[PDB]
Ligand binder design. Structure first.
Ligand SMILES: [Mg+2]
Ligand SMILES: [Zn+2]
Ligand SMILES: [Zn+2]
Lengths: 54, 124, 88, 597, 290, 339, 100
């Protein structure tokens, strides 16, 4: 969901979606942190009806 | 809900699965579960879960000095750094967290010596 | 089962670490698992304690499986039967 | 050269001295440097002879990869001797018993003969020994006082004259103690006090301290500040020493104490509590091949069945070893793979001794006798079912799996009468489930741990299961004599409809016209004829508390069953309820088995 | 959880060995598990008929007068001795308890009465004619069966060899010997043939073998689970129990006094039951109150 | 040497059902596949003679493999290599400045590494076959290795000898014990006697301490010794006949025994005197008859084996000339007849 | 010191002096079936007549039909003189518990 490579030629420091129920990417932004450095912010949404076990 | 696998991330120290769904690891068969399985007599289930599925391994102990030995079938190593010529190494079924536990006791200057079960022979 | 254990030594012992030390003093690994390993380990090293492997806690701390239930009895191969009924 | 099978029969504990460390150590730590480029520096605290923790390199000592190497200890030669943190108190006792100038004992050995061995030294040290005079060298034994500013320093107080018993001084004091003194004081020959001072310490194997951990910083500081102490340092009792040397000696000893007993990061802090080594790692375990979900009710499942979602059934696998007697049965699992249920995930090929995924499978691939097929979980497989806290021995039970083909169901489903085994209900309880894949564990699951083995309580010697809340009042209504609308009867069609769900062999209704009327006790008797028991007790329905204010039917207050025929009375908690000793299902168990009950 | 973990670590080393004893690696904790050698899942509550009867009702119901042989004088004499011994033991148990009343109901491995009832049900024959040869024979079979009953605890090899039986194994078969002599009495087995007696005796021995405890069973873990479980309901109460000084029975205070072997000085709810000496004083309440 | 040794081991059994169909045959095959030709328990195993004692096939209890295991007590032909022994056939493989590595041929596999000094690398060459002398306790039997790692020295015959003062009699049971060594020496002599005379003559000429010329060194049947001007007024005696007579108790064994280099090392002769008139450079050692007799008997066995290994190493004279540098090195280390 | 315990000799009690029961315990029968099923998963060589598609059913039928090639050893005592007194029982001649 987020591609991230560190240079040494590159090491793959990526983030994988590890959930058994699928999501939809709802909002992506790249805001500036307290140290004025970019970080990645992702929002994922799940359409949740009532189902057995709730 | 959670179901994982026969494999996944493990702890570098204990060799056991990581904790819970968040780490994508396993689930805990705790102290009380082993009480119930022991009360039922289900020892092959304990080997399957606590050894084959958690961190079971092979340990090598020299018969004559009771200390951990060094064995390697490939690249032949059959040695023991306590007698060095009388080595009589047997393989015992253990767990990595138990071997780590014994190394920690020796780090506190406590000598752990394992007396292996003696050989038994038919008469004559 | 409670009463016979608590009175097997001729005195009423407890289910605390003091009663365990009175009934099974040489079982260091069982006594370490209960309450306080460092204190029990320190006395075991000083006293040169020999710990036979029996019960549940001692085999478990050693990475083994208790000789209990399906592992109480040993199974051996029936040689006199296999030679007379099986082939290589 | 093969290592034969062995088991540990006993374990003996001893104090590790310096010869033990020099024999067991595989290398000597000499440099404080960590890494030479990417590989560990030879002679450092990460030397590969002590084991490997990366996948790049092997262990030099045993030539194994990271998974098969258990680590190997190293040696660090101390320039100045150090005291053992774990046995400081022991050292104190030895300083209160023997003479500091000659090593001969002060107390009377034969005085303490009547004590037991583990108490002779303690009791002889508890006595007053200050101011006494040795009978060999004629010396005055001072007061051995313990410094209050740390856990290791000892002072000698000779009538106000002050000395500091440095570890080398303590070593030379202890080295004059004979083995006879040790034996007469109760200790064994392996517990000579000379072992209590360390000149060479043991660097624990890297398997104990992966992440090359804040315990590595303690070892690194210890090695780095050990080099500062001159190698040719010697201490004599009464000698004056500089301040830099004294600061270095105390800091080295403080580091070693905090390496082992810091707040008891330290080695012994890993042991004690519920999150410690013994309880979290040894007495319990994180395991693989296990599932957890919220439990749910399902009245169509048998008591020894658990409803299992299909998604979990394609995650947990059963190990099948390919032989001549099961090659045909296992082939359809193999063909489906991961594209259709029931399929398989992996195959272990005994030729190359490796595991292959089923989607990365070769064109010319086939099952061979000796392969291990890991197939999906199907209906009829056995599984352990667990609810925590596991307080009784029915808290883990083996159920037959029914796989729920509906993809929108994520719950473990079971019959409400099975909840008594686990003290469970459906307000949000979660339960664990794992399917035995090993042949030995599968045999044990169905022969030892099946829930029919815990139908009778081990605690109370009575039945655990029965009717709960709906078949209790439902059994009363069915067997009740009169309905508010006359006699409690039903026609042939509605009597046949009671058996169309029981999943037993339907009874014969051929001797019945459509307008024939069957009462509830005749329908119940049609089911109890298979397991004919005898029963006669008053039902829960009849209470002397209610008798004055309500009219009891005389045919409802006397429940009698004769060879499976319900002659009269109603069925309720007394006869059919869960936990009812002497009830219908307790009697069926005693004559036909707990699986028949 | 605190009381459960301490009970299990103190008891888990108790394991059944090949003599049905409970030991800690060599050291006996029980000479026989549960003093009867049985599994708790293999018990049935069964009433013993002779306990409450008087000397005349006992002789009316169980003394057989059809045959004037000295065997039936001995058969009834053994019924009284079992009746008297049961009364003596459990009246004494009533003495050293607060409110533990005697009962004519025991948990036994085999329900002998129901076995006889089932075979009588399936018997093609009805009321058998008086056959004095078979009545004496069935008595010998039952007498021999009871004499050889403790061999259930050893094996059939020693039963064939008739080797001596340990005294503690004779005592473990006393309730089953007692029950069989009641439910297989001559007055109760007149409509049973000698072939049907062999079926009954074979069935009793089979069901008695199936109720024995297994070798290598962790029965100390079983006990700790069974005794710690009710403490949850004990703790769910204790706002229904006194908390005052001298009668504190809240929380798990009394259980902790027992399991920690606390001295009498540390007991917060100690009681005692004093029985008067004079029977005339016993009945009068003012005498008891004064 | 060769000897009989009893070992204990535990064998794993992956297929207990197939294994138990022919237990003795399968046990022999597994023991030969595992233990023959390796170093184990401070020894080296050649042959598995038999299985004295074994256990039933137990099933492994701490895992779910279904595999078996068996405790086996077996007897094996081992070859222990003592101190200061004489290996007379080694092939130098490597000759560096650090160490000189060679491997023995006629004996059971021993690799001999000489710590290279500044007087060795200029002599020894690859392919040359020389005799070596061993040292004390330096025959380390590293478990699981195919040979014996041992230090060695080029065997220049010494000029020294020892004197044992015997103060006890060699009784009947010890004589019976030494009868095995007597029989071993007899077998070595009968193996020596099957050859052509010249090779024994030439190798004994090389390895005799002094120089003796023109066919005066060997009487095979009677062993009368070298006929040089009767150096001693007493004839050297037979050890074999002395033991055979101590069996019948006709001789006493007290006094000072010695074997000066003037004697033939391989011959059963020795010097026994009633007075310490031996010209040695060390103090005579007081001992019993057992120590002295074991020492001299095993020395005779060692030297007979040494000469037989020299004989079996070289049969033609072309290899004799190809190694003539070692011949000259040994020749220069002799003494003339200036006595 | 001498860490290695001395070897033991296996003392088999004669069949007419055995004190343990002639009926297999449920633990022993379960262990026998599990061991034999694993052996069949290794080899597959059986003397059972009927065909079964799983090792477990072959093992149970072999136990029930008294054809199982295993023996039960009950370790009675370890004498401190070196003897290991055991009892050997043939499950083909033993009673079989209620495995249902
Ligand atoms: Mg709930
Ligand atoms: Zn060793
Ligand atoms: Zn390693």
């Amino acid at each position: 969901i987020i591609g991230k490579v560190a240079k040494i030629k590159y090491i793959d420091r990526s983030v994988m979606y590890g959930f058994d129920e699928p999501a939809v990417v709802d909002a992506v932004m790249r805001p500036h942190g307290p140290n004025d450095e970019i970080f990645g912010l992702m929002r994922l949404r799940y359409e949740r009806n009532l189902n057995i076990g709730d | 809900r959670y179901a994982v696998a026969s494999y996944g991330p493990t702890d570098a120290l204990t060799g056991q699965p990581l904790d819970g769904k968040r780490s994508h690891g396993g689930l805990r068969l705790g102290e009380m579960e082993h009480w119930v399985l022991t009360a039922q007599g289900a020892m092959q289930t304990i080997i399957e879960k606590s050894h084959d599925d958690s961190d079971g391994c092979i340990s090598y102990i020299c018969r004559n000095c009771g200390e951990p030995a060094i064995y390697n079938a490939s690249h032949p190593i059959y040695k023991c750094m306590n007698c060095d010529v009388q080595a009589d190494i047997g393989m015992v079924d253990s767990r990595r967290s138990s071997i780590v536990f014994q190394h920690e006791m020796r780090a506190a200057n406590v000598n752990i010596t394992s007396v292996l079960s003696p050989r038994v022979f038919q008469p004559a | 089962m409670y009463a016979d254990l608590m009175t097997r030594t001729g005195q009423v012992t407890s289910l605390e670490k003091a009663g365990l030390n009175a009934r099974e003093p040489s079982n260091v690994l069982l006594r370490m698992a209960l309450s306080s390993p460092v204190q029990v380990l320190t006395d075991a090293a000083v006293d040169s304690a020999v710990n036979p492997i029996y019960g549940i806690a001692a085999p478990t701390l050693m990475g083994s499986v208790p000789r209990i239930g399906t592992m109480y009895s040993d199974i051996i191969m029936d040689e006199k039967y296999i030679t007379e009924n099986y082939k290589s | 050269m093969e290592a034969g099978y062995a088991e540990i029969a006993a374990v003996q504990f001893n104090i590790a001295g310096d010869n033990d460390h020099k024999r067991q150590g595989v290398m000597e730590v000499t440099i404080s440097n960590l890494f030479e480029g990417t590989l560990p520096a030879e002679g450092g605290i990460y030397d590969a002879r002590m084991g490997t923790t990366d996948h790049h390199y092997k262990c030099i000592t045993c030539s194994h990869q990271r998974k098969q190497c258990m680590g190997h200890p190293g040696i660090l030669q101390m320039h100045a001797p150090v005291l053992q943190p774990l046995f400081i108190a022991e050292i104190r006792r030895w300083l209160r018993v023997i003479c500091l100038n000659c090593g001969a004992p002060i107390v009377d050995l034969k005085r303490y003969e009547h004590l037991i061995r583990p108490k002779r030294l303690i009791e002889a040290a508890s006595s007053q020994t200050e101011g006494k005079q040795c009978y060999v060298c004629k010396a005055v034994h001072p007061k051995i006082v313990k410094d209050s500013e740390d856990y290791f320093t000892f002072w000698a107080d000779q009538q106000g004259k002050i000395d500091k018993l440095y570890p080398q001084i303590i070593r030379e004091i202890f080295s004059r103690v004979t083995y006879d003194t040790v034996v007469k004081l109760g200790r064994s020959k392996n517990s000579h006090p000379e072992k209590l001072v360390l000149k060479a310490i043991q660097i624990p194997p890297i398997s104990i301290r992966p992440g090359i951990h804040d315990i590595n910083n303690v070892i690194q500081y210890l090695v780095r500040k050990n080099l500062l102490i001159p190698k040719d340092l010697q201490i004599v009792r009464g000698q004056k020493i500089p301040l830099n040397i004294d600061r270095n000696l105390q800091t080295i000893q403080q580091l070693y104490y905090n390496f082992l007993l810091d707040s008891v990061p330290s080695i012994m802090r890993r042991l004690p509590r519920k999150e410690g080594r013994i309880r979290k790692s040894l007495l319990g375990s994180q395991v693989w091949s296990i599932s957890r979900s919220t439990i749910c009710g399902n009245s169509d499942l048998h008591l020894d069945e658990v409803g299992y979602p299909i998604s979990f059934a394609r995650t947990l696998q059963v190990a099948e070893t390919v032989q001549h007697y099961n090659i045909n049965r296992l082939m359809p699992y193999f063909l489906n793979g991961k594209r259709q249920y029931p399929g398989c995930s992996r195959v272990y090929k005994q030729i190359t001794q490796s595991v292959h995924d089923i989607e990365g499978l070769k064109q010319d691939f086939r099952l061979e006798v000796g392969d291990i097929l890991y197939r999906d979980v199907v209906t009829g497989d056995v599984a352990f079912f667990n609810r925590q806290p596991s307080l009784e021995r029915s808290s883990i039970g083996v159920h037959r799996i029914v796989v729920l083909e509906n993809p929108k169901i994520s719950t473990f489903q079971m019959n409400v009468s099975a909840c008594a085994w686990y003290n469970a209900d459906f307000d949000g309880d979660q339960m664990n489930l794992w399917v035995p894949w090993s042949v030995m564990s599968r045999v044990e699951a169905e022969l030892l741990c099946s829930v029919r083995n815990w139908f009778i309580s081990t605690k109370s010697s009575g039945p655990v299961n029965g009717q709960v809340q709906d078949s209790t009042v439902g059994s009363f209504l069915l067997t009740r004599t009169n309905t508010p609308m006359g006699k409690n009867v039903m026609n042939k069609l509605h009597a046949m409809g009671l058996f169309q769900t029981t999943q037993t062999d339907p009874p014969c209704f051929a001797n019945y016209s459509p307008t024939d009327l069957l009462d509830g006790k005749s329908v119940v008797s049609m089911l109890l004829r298979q397991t004919p028991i005898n029963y006669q007790r008053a039902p829960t329905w009849y209470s002397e508390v209610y008798a004055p204010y309500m009219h009891y039917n005389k045919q409802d207050i006397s429940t009698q069953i004769r060879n499976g025929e319900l002659i009269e009375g109603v069925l309720d908690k007394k006869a059919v309820g869960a936990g009812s000793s002497g009830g219908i299902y307790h009697l069926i168990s005693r004559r036909y088995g707990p699986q028949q009950a | 959880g605190y009381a459960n973990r301490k009970a299990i670590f103190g008891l888990q080393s108790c394991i059944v060995d090949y003599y049905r004893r409970v030991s800690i690696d060599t050291r006996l904790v029980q000479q026989l598990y549960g003093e009867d050698g049985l599994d708790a899942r293999q018990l049935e509550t069964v009433r013993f008929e002779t306990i409450m009867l008087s000397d005349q009702e006992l002789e009316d119901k169980f003394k057989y007068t059809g045959i004037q042989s000295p065997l039936f004088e001995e058969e009834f004499s053994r019924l009284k001795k079992d009746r008297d011994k049961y009364r003596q033991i459990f009246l004494n148990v009533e003495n050293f308890n607060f409110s533990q009343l005697l009962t004519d109901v025991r948990q036994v491995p085999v329900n002998v009465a129901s076995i006889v009832k089932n075979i009588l049900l399936s018997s093609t024959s009805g009321v058998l004619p008086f056959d004095e040869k078979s009545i004496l024979q069935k008595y010998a079979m039952v007498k021999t069966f009871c004499k050889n009953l403790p061999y259930v605890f050893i094996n059939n090899i020693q039963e064939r060899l008739q080797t001596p039986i340990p005294v503690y194994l004779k005592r473990a078969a006393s309730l089953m010997r007692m029950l069989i002599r009641i439910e297989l009495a001559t007055v109760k087995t007149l409509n049973i043939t000698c072939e049907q007696m062999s079926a009954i005796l074979d069935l009793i021995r089979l069901q008695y073998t199936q109720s024995l405890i297994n070798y290598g069973e962790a029965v100390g873990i079983l006990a700790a689970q069974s005794v710690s479980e009710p403490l949850t309901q004990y703790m769910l109460d204790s706002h229904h129990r006194s908390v005052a000084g001298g009668t504190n029975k809240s929380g798990i205070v009394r259980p902790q006094e027992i399991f920690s072997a606390k001295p009498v000085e540390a007991e917060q709810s100690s009681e005692m039951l004093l029985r008067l000496k004079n029977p005339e004083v016993e009945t009068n309440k003012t005498y008891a109150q004064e | 040497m060769i000897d009989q040794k009893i070992f204990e081991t535990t064998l794993n059994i992956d297929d207990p059902t197939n294994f138990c169909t022919n237990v003795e045959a399968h046990l022999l095959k597994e023991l030969e596949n595992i233990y023959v030709g390796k170093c184990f328990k401070n020894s080296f195993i050649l042959n598995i003679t038999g299985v004295i004692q074994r256990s039933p096939c137990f099933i492994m209890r701490t895992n779910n493999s279904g595999r078996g295991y068996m405790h086996v007590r077996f007897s094996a032909v081992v070859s222990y290599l003592n101190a200061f022994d004489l290996i007379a056939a080694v092939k130098i493989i490597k000759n560096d400045s650090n160490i000189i590595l060679g491997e023995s041929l006629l004996t059971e596999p021993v690799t001999i590494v000489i710590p290279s000094s500044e007087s060795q690398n200029n002599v020894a060459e690859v392919g040359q076959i020389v005799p070596v002398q061993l040292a004390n306790s330096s025959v380390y039997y590293i478990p699981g290795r195919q040979q014996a790692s041992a230090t060695g020295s080029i065997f220049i015959p010494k000029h020294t000898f020892s004197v044992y003062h015997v103060q006890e009699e060699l009784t009947q049971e010890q004589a019976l014990n030494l009868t095995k060594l007597v029989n071993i020496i007899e077998m070595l002599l009968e193996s020596r006697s099957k050859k052509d005379f010249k090779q024994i003559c030439f190798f004994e000429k090389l390895y005799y301490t002094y120089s003796i010329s023109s066919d005066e060194i060997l009487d095979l049947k009677i062993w009368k010794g070298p006929k040089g001007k009767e150096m001693s007024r007493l004839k050297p005696c037979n050890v074999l006949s002395f033991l055979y007579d101590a069996l019948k108790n006709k001789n006493s064994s007290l006094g000072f025994w010695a074997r000066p280099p003037n004697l033939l090392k391989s011959s059963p002769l020795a010097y026994q005197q009633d007075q310490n008139s031996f010209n040695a450079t060390e103090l005579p050692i007081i001992c019993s008859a057992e120590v002295m007799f074991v020492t001299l008997l095993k020395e005779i066995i060692n030297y007979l084996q040494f000469i037989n290994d020299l004989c079996d190493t070289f049969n033609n004279e072309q290899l004799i000339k190809r190694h003539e540098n070692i011949w000259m090195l040994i020749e220069q280390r002799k003494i003339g007849h200036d006595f | 010191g001498f860490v290695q315990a001395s070897s033991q000799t296996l003392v088999i009690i004669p069949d007419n002096e055995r004190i343990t029961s002639n009926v297999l315990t449920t633990f022993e029968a379960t262990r026998l079936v599990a061991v034999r099923a694993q052996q069949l998963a290794i080899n597959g060589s059986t003397m059972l007549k009927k065909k079964y598609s799983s090792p477990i059913d072959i093992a149970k039928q072999e136990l029930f039909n008294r054809k199982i090639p295993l023996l039960v050893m009950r370790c009675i005592k370890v004498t401190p003189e070196g003897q290991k007194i055991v009892e050997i029982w043939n499950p083909r001649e033993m009673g079989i518990p209620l495995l249902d």
